[PDB]
DNA sequence: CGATAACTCGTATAATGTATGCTATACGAAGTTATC
DNA sequence: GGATAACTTCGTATAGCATACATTATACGAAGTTATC
DNA sequence: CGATAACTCGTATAATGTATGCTATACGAAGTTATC
DNA sequence: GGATAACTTCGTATAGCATACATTATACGAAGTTATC
């Protein structure tokens, strides 16, 4: 149509209104779909119910995850609705097939995974293992971890911290102002406070790295093979890198990741959030305080991130034995 | 399956849509299918008896039927199910849904208000708390009957792990393992959710472990790691392991009913619900014990795989630790 | 329009889908709106936006309260929307004049009032003062005042408690189950617990009134001049009666009220609700607990019912006067 | 066509909005019409495509997301009240606004608040004016005492009159605040001054002689000589009261920076912020803090005390034990 | 110099809040089957 | 050939749990890119 | 049979959340108007 | 006469307060009612 093409360019025009990752994915999915449509001879747009149905069944067949499969379907939906046409999910065949695949895969045993926990226990060990190392890069990494566990911020969030977003409490603790997270985009943002210990781990890095010479410099920067920080206010350390710190720190204590092709074999971006949640639950922290901690507003996820004490567990075991 | 999509009535994209729905019938739980079919039956029967066309449903008839269910004394939650299944049957066949019609919406609201105003209130399982497990145990631990040994292990596990019966019935021998402490660890695979908060694994206490260990020793379920932990035990006191057939949740529910009968006698005369323990009695009782013990809410919800604080608060509302700010203020 | 009359017939057929009070006021406003329309040759339905404007000004002129005028417009709005027709408030004429009337009256000095508090201070007096009486009347009224202050339940709610709705905590405190309230109509309801002391006051009344003969009997009932209680399971004590209990208790300690003709010169139904709100406030109870106490979800009315200390006062004064 | 009729009715019931509202409406409208007649765009009815360009312009001019929101807002009010469809309902506009906000928050744009005028400050300021016979000082030292002690907002301060003052059993002053622009003024009808502040306010009431007439606004103008000019037909302007804050701040820290930054020196809300902050360190419950200053939005008070240590959170506690 | 430490891409998949629609349990009773 | 313990199936009544929706992140091996060694 | 304690009804006005639309402050600067 | 102190009046850039919406409940003085005294 014409109004359709219009609504599309209007979406593309102000494509900044959406996330970079959202577009990265709309595209990725669109190629995948286009490819399949072609190799199967189907009009990829508008997408017809039965075609999106065979297509999802196809992805299921390729052994992809339910979340993965919902993503393509999801993106196809965004493309159509946003353009003014009905959603392929607005059709019985697509909406029902999607339900079916979830149920079928779940039953066959599939289940969503989640970052391996990086809990308090681990932090201490890692700290009493790098606490000294004058190595300018060990200084950095030990601060990252400290901040990641203390604030539960997501990596992409830590990466965007500038030196100017730091302040303090009359008590001497640091306040890192976070402006944009995955769930909030406001000019009011939020303030995450660090403890006396971690605020310390961060101060040492701020000097050693000399990132503080310009308030607009991102807090964390890359350190080259000679051991020299490269402060900057244009380029922030990549999330791929922040994930690396977790992998490296994990390898530094457990060594080579058991080549099994599986994810979460070592710590990663989210390892600190799940870990931190788990540490609060055990500590008896309340539901509202655990939400403030990770910027959540629903008990769920915190619940997913839990399957606490394994061995001699607790709670009912502690209650029964006494 | 369904009553009978009228050759005339049923027509066009509805026979089409209806077909698509059976094509992907795996998109809904079998229990969901059980209730859909029950409601249609129920509605089709009312329709014949009252000379009404059962499909598509006219709003004015669905309203009459809804007031009909109310007069039968059914609960608002039940009435809601019937409307719900009728809405699904319709939406999924491409037609408007009742309750989307002004009359049906207004009558549902009226029925709900009138009913609440008549004193109708939701119920919950009679709790089977720690103090019940102890009494029940002090009595059954001395029995050699294979049945009593099995039933006492079930109770221990039910109370210790807070698992749903459907889940206990699925446990197979190989899903058990030992811990450093010498206590059992039960692993629960295959749920229904991708985010199974329940807990992949549940640890049994030392006491409960001994109880399960004794059932395994006397039933010989260990003869095959694929046997389900719980099986039948017949008239002659002989267990019957199997790896293809698990105990029916009905039977487990029977163990709670029977264990309550053993101690308190036959059930009351009214046809009241929850006059004896059922398959949720342990979960409710455990939540209450943990609360009384001071366990945190997140820690309680984690213990039983809950996700809706509203339900756990429902289970511990009558505890004194939940009386409020005014009571505190008055009693200082 | 066939549709309009069919929508109206639907509503009147299931009028019981709304509060009896909602119906009571709909009818009041309509007749009032019918009278004016006739005395001015105006079509009363569907109402014309320019006429509703006039009518709302006529009410302002009549010197009625901002809320009273909002109620009138409010019903005329409902009548129409529920008809399938647009609402008078959908017109700039009515929309703006309603903001204006409020704005004006507010400046002119009109303020929304609220019940005279019945705080712990008074309950303690009223109790020590009636606590010894053996008169059924006195015994009943003390129990009512006790529940009213302890639970913050609205009179309508209290008037509905049947003896079967009472249970006890393992500790011994009474628990009253409430099914319906101004803002909740469910089969789940909520439980309102009483203090060891108040449960006493209610126990004494139960035994002396004989309402426990039938679990279906309403907890409170009439008490004739002969001092004898007349329990019932069909008729409940009037909310007017409950109001009278507040008025009566307030005369017993302050004699007749002013000749002002003003509302709230004595305690009324809501008196305990605002009173207890205030006491909790002064005790430092948290926002979530103060809300759990009075069935609120936002903070507005709590903040409304507040004005606390005025003499030495506290807050900033205590703070300043080091 | 009928928009004229619509516009008429809006002007007919113009009392339906505050003076400050019409001000921004007219102001924003001028900015709009200007931009248009300089880009050749019918300024009204505004086409979504045009408004979009305009909004992008306000962004390029460097304004805040909040300010941009005000323009779009007033623009909407105009149309809605004229019977026309508001520009926010158009995809183009709603899309740019999402873009602008994300782009700006991402650029580091932060919302600011007044500079805290806490207790310590109220003491310093006093011990440096406490002993002074400067007719002006006496006034300004009292305005601060009240502002801090009552958490009242300047417009309110400016409206107090001797008629509205009374005495407590303890002999403290009790300012009665009436006609507050709100039907549900969940803030209070009476505020009590402390013994200390009562003294200060008294000292000003005599030296100013505003007590000569009851309708006399507690606070008045004071000429370049040291003579209070009481009145009951005109009140000290809010701008002036603001200044009193600025002035007292300059008196202690000098002048501001070149950076046209906002909130470099105390201002109207500086009292509330600090007032809120002190009560918090004391341990005053949120509701008790909220009512003390007439607050009804817990997020606001939470903003004022966010940087306090007592609000650092569960993880900090957990890491320190 | 070339070799290295230390850091853009694309497909795959987790996350984020929650009314309410789907999904369990409740439980009397009919149906089964191996044992008395 | 019964009667019966102990299930299993069934169908309807009700309690309770979890996901569709629309984006927005992370996961991670494999390439590509620089300043150092 | 009265007199009386203790209890329908109709108009008037309060109470229920809260996203966001209206309101108020911020502040440089330009007019004012009595003192210096 | 000229130069200010100390303000007003202003326009616009921003922060923050509270209300529309759709019912649902209470206020309270009167008139009506019914056992009792
Ligand atoms: Mg079923
Ligand atoms: Mg018990
Ligand atoms: Mg049994
Ligand atoms: Mg038994
Ligand atoms: Mg029992
Ligand atoms: Mg309204
Ligand atoms: Mg309608
Ligand atoms: Mg969402
Ligand atoms: Mg039998
Ligand atoms: Mg509401």
Q: Residue A63 region, left (φ>0) first, then alpha (ψ -120 to 50), else beta?
A: left
Q: Rounded CA gap, D278 and D121, in Å?
A: 11
DSSP A220-270: ---EETTTEE---SS-PPPHHHHHHHHHHHHHHHH-S---SS-S-SS--TT
Contact between residue B17 and residue B5 where contact means Cβ atoms under 8 Å apart: no
Burial class from Cβ neighbours inside 10 Å (0-12, 13-18, 19+) for residue D47 reads middle
Helices B249-264, B130-140: crossing angle, 10 deg rounding: 80
Q: Residue D31 in contact with residue D74, Cβ under 8 Å?
A: no
Q: Across the interface, which of B77, B102, B121 has its CB nearest the CB of C10?
A: B102
Cα gap B95→B59, rounded to integer Å: 12
Tokens standing for residue A293: 């901690």
Taking the C1' atom of every nucleotide in all shown strands and the CA of B235, the nearest one is F5
Distance between CA atoms of C139 and C123, rounded to whole angstroms? 14
Instruction: Tell me which of A187, A219, A280 to substitute to probe the interface with D (most D C-beta atoms closer than 10 Å).
Output: A187
Q: Do A316 and B161 touch (CB under 8 A)?
A: yes
C-beta of residue D200 within 8 angstroms of C-beta of residue D148:
no
B129/chain C closest Cα distance in angstroms: 13
Q: Which residue has the tokens 């009943």?
A: C140
* Token pair recorded at residue D28: 């924003």
Longest dimension (CA), chain D: 71
CA angle B277, B282, B286 (to 5 degrees): 140
- DSSP conformation class of B172: B
CA of B266 to the centre of ligand 9 (A): 15
**Torsion of Cα atoms, D17 then D22 then D24 then D26, to 10°:** 150
Write the CB contacts of C273 (distance below 8 Å, at least 6 apart in sequence): C115, C148, C152, C154, C294, C305
CB A212 within 8 A of CB A206: yes
Whats the size of chain A, residue-wise? Answer: 322
β-pair partners for C44: C47
Q: Are D140 and D132 in contact (CB under 8 A)?
A: no
- Is residue C44 a contact partner of residue B137, using CB atoms and an 8 Å limit? no
Q: Which two tokens stand for residue A226?
A: 């000679």
What pairing do the DSSP bridges indicate for beta strands A174-180 and A166-168? antiparallel
Report how far residue C113's alpha carbon sits from residue C65's, in angstroms, rounded to the nearest whole number: 10
CA distance C194 to chain B (A): 6
Cβ neighbours of B121 in C, within 8 Å: 177, 179, 187-189
- Residue whose tokens read 């003491």: D123
DSSP letter at D217 equals B
Please tell me what DSSP assigns to residue D129: T
- C129 CB contacts (<8 Å, ≥6 apart)? C252, C253
Interface of A with D (CB under 8 A): 7, 10-11, 13-14, 16-18, 120, 149-152, 162, 167, 169-171, 173, 175, 177, 179-180, 185-189, 191-198, 276, 279-280, 283, 285, 289-290, 292-293
Those nucleotides of strand G lying less than 7 Å from any protein Cβ are 4-18, 21-29, 34-36
Contact call for residues C119 and C150 (beta carbons, < 8 A)? no
C192 CB-near residues (< 8 Å, 6+ apart): C150, C151, C153, C175, C176, C177, C178
Note the helical H segments in C168-320: 196-209, 239-251, 271-283, 287-294, 300-304, 316-320
Q: List the one residue out of D75, D11, D21 whose CA is nearest residue D43.
A: D75
Residue C218 gets which letter from DSSP?
Answer: B
Do B229 and B177 meet the contact criterion of CB atoms below 8 Å apart?
Answer: no
| Interatomic CA distance for residues D53 and A138, integer angstroms | 49
Whether the Cβ atoms of residue D174 and residue D200 lie closer than 8 Å to each other: no
Is there a contact between B290 and A316 if contact means CB atoms under 8 Å apart? yes
Annotation says A270 is catalytic: yes
Q: Give the residue with minimal CA–C1' separation from E21.
A: B84
Q: Are strands D165-167 and D173-176 parallel, antiparallel or unpaired?
A: antiparallel
Q: What angle do CA B284, B287, B289 make, to 5 degrees?
A: 110
| Strand H nucleotides where any atom sits below 7 Å of a protein CB | 4-30, 35-37
State how far the Cα of A72 lies from the Cα of A51, in Å rounded to an integer.
Answer: 13
Closest CA to B97 of B116, B82, B76: B82
As a whole number of angstroms, the distance between CA C95 and CA C89 comes to 5
Give residue B164 CA to ligand 2 midpoint distance, Å.
21
Query: Helix (H, G, I), strand (E, B), or coil: what is residue B88?
Result: helix
Contact C264, C113 (CB under 8 A): yes
- The region that residue B92 occupies, defined by phi over 0 for left and psi between -120 and 50 for alpha, beta otherwise, is alpha
State the ligand closest to the CA atom of B288: 2
Q: Is A127 in a helix, a strand, or coil?
A: helix
Which tokens hold the place of C146? 């006790």
Ligand nearest to the CA of B100: 7
User: What is chain C's length?
Assistant: 322
Chain CA centroid to CA C233, Å:
23
Q: CB-based contacts of B112: which residues, under 8 Å, 6+ apart?
A: B76, C185
> Which residues of chain B are within 8 Å of residue A99 when distances are taken between CB atoms?
24, 27-28
List of domains in chain C: 1-111 (1.10.150.130), 113-311 (1.10.443.10)
Distance CA A94, CA A88 (A): 6
Contacts 24+ apart (CB under 8 A), B5-14: B5/B55, B6/B53, B6/B55, B9/B53, B9/B55, B9/B56, B10/B55, B13/B94, B14/B93, B14/B94, B14/B95
CA dist., res. C315 & res. C318, Å (int): 6
For residue B194, list chain A residues with Cβ-Cβ distance below 8 A: 66-67, 102, 106, 110-112
C10 contact residues in B (CB cutoff 8 A): 102-103, 106
Contact D131, D151 (CB under 8 A): no
Count how many Cα atoms sit within 13 Å of the Cα of residue B203 in the half-sphere of its side chain: 23
The single residue listed with the structure tokens 């297509």 is A55
Helix (H) or strand (E) holding D246: helix D238-253
Instruction: Name the residue among B207, B130, B185, B288 with its Cα closest to residue A309.
Output: B185
Distances (CA, A) of C143 to C121, C126, C148, C201, D226: 16, 11, 8, 5, 65
CA C89 vs. chain centroid, Å, equals 27
CB A162 within 8 A of CB A179: no
Write down the experimental method used for this entry: X-ray
Nearest in space to C88 (alpha carbons), one of C41, C42, C56, C63: C56
CA B258 / ligand 4 centre spacing (Å): 6
How many Cβ atoms are within 10 Å of B169's Cβ, its own excluded? Answer: 20
- The answer to whether residues B103 and C12 touch, using CB atoms and an 8 Å cutoff, is no
Please tell me which residue of chain D has the smallest CA distance to A6: D92
How far from D37 is each of A88, D43, D59, D60, CA to CA, in Å? Answer: 45, 8, 19, 18
> Interior CA angle at C297 toward C296 and C302, to 5°?
55
For B187-203, give one letter per residue: b (16+ CB within 10 A) or e: ebeebeebebbbbebbb
Structure token digits, residue C191: 């439980």
- As annotated, the active-site residues of C are 154, 270, 273, 296, 305
Burial class (CB in 10 A: 0-12, 13-18, 19+), A1: exposed
Distance, in Å, from the CA atom of D258 to the CA atom of B223, rounded to the nearest integer, reads 86
Residue of least CA–C1' distance to E10: A28
Burial of A185 (0-12, 13-18, 19+ CB in 10 A): middle
CA–CA separation, D293 and D114 (whole Å): 15
Measure CA B31 to chain center.
11
Q: Which nucleotide is nearest to A67 (CA to C1')?
A: E13
Query: What's the CA gap between C5 and C83, in Å, rounded?
Result: 7
Closest to D289 measured CA to CA, from C316, B326, C311, C283: C316
Q: How many residues does chain D have?
A: 321
Collapsing DSSP to helix, strand or coil, D210 comes out as: helix
Read off the tokens for A77: 């939906």
Place of tokens 């019938």: B25
**SS3 for B171?**
coil
Q: Which residue has the tokens 């007033």?
A: D74
Instruction: Report the alpha-carbon distance of residue D304 to residue D112 in Å, rounded.
Output: 11
Q: CB B135: neighbour CB atoms within 10 A?
A: 11
Question: What are the structure tokens assigned to B133, written together?
Answer: 């497990």
Interatomic CA distance for residues B217 and B229, integer angstroms: 11
Chain centre distance of CA A267: 13
Dist. CA D295–CA D275, nearest whole Å = 12
List, as one string, the DSSP characters of A63-125: T--HHHHHHHHHHHHHHHHHHTSPPGGGSHHHHHHHHHHHHHHHHTT----------HHHHHH
| Residues of D acting as catalytic residues | 153, 269, 272, 295, 304
What distances in angstroms separate CA D119 from CA B10, B327, C322, D191, D272, one per listed residue?
A: 78, 37, 11, 18, 11
Question: Nearest to residue D25, comparing CAs of D83, D78, D68, D67?
Answer: D78
Q: A75 C-alpha vs ligand 8 centroid, how far in Å?
A: 15
CB C175 within 8 A of CB C169: yes
CB-nearest partner of D16 from C96, C286, C309: C96
With contact defined as beta carbons under 8 Å apart, do C118 and C275 qualify?
yes
Contact predicate A265/A251, CB 8 Å: no
Residues C106, D196: C-beta atoms closer than 8 Å: no
Enter the resolution in angstroms. Answer: 2.9
Which is nearest to B246 in space by CA: B234, B229, B258, B259? Answer: B229
Q: From the CA of A118 to the C1' of E21: give the distance in Å.
A: 37
Tell me the residue ranges of DSSP E strands in chain C.
Answer: 166-168, 174-181, 184-193, 222-223, 229-230
Structure tokens at B114: 């009138």
Per CB-CB distance under 8 Å, the chain B contacts of A104 are: 26
Nucleotide nearest to D223 (CA to C1'): H6
C185: which strand partners? C180
């Amino acid at each position: 149509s014409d109004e359709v093409r219009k609504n599309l360019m209007d979406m593309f025009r102000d494509r900044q209104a959406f996330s970079e990752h959202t577009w990265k994915m709309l595209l990725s999915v669109c190629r995948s779909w286009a490819a399949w449509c072609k190799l199967n001879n189907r009009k990829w747009f508008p997408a017809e119910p039965e075609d999106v149905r065979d297509y999802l069944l196809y992805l299921q067949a390729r052994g992809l995850a339910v979340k993965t499969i919902q993503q393509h379907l999801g993106q196809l939906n965004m493309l159509h609705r946003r353009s003014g046409l009905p959603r392929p999910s607005d059709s019985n065949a697509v909406s029902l097939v999607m339900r079916r695949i979830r149920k079928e895969n779940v039953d066959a045993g599939e289940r969503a995974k989640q970052a391996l926990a990086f809990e308090r226990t681990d932090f201490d060990q890692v700290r009493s293992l790098m606490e000294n190392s004058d190595r300018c890069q060990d200084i950095r990494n030990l601060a990252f971890l400290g901040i990641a566990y203390n604030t539960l911020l997501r990596i992409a969030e830590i990466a965007r911290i500038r030196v100017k977003d730091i302040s303090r409490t009359d008590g001497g603790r640091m306040l890192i102002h976070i402006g944009r997270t995955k769930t909030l985009v406001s000019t009011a943002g939020v303030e995450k406070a660090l403890s006396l210990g971690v605020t310390k781990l961060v101060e040492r890095w701020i000097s050693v790295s000399g990132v503080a010479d310009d308030p607009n410099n991102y807090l964390f920067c890359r350190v080259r093979k000679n051991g020299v920080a490269a402060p900057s206010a244009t380029s922030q350390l990549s999330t791929r890198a922040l994930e690396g710190i977790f992998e490296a720190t994990h390898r530094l204590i457990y060594g080579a990741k058991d080549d099994s092709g599986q994810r979460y074999l070592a710590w990663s971006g989210h390892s600190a959030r799940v870990g931190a949640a788990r540490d609060m639950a055990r500590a008896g922290v309340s539901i509202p305080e655990i939400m403030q901690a990770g910027g959540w507003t629903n008990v769920n996820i915190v619940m997913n991130y839990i399957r606490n004490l394994d061995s001699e567990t607790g709670a009912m075991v502690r209650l029964l034995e006494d």
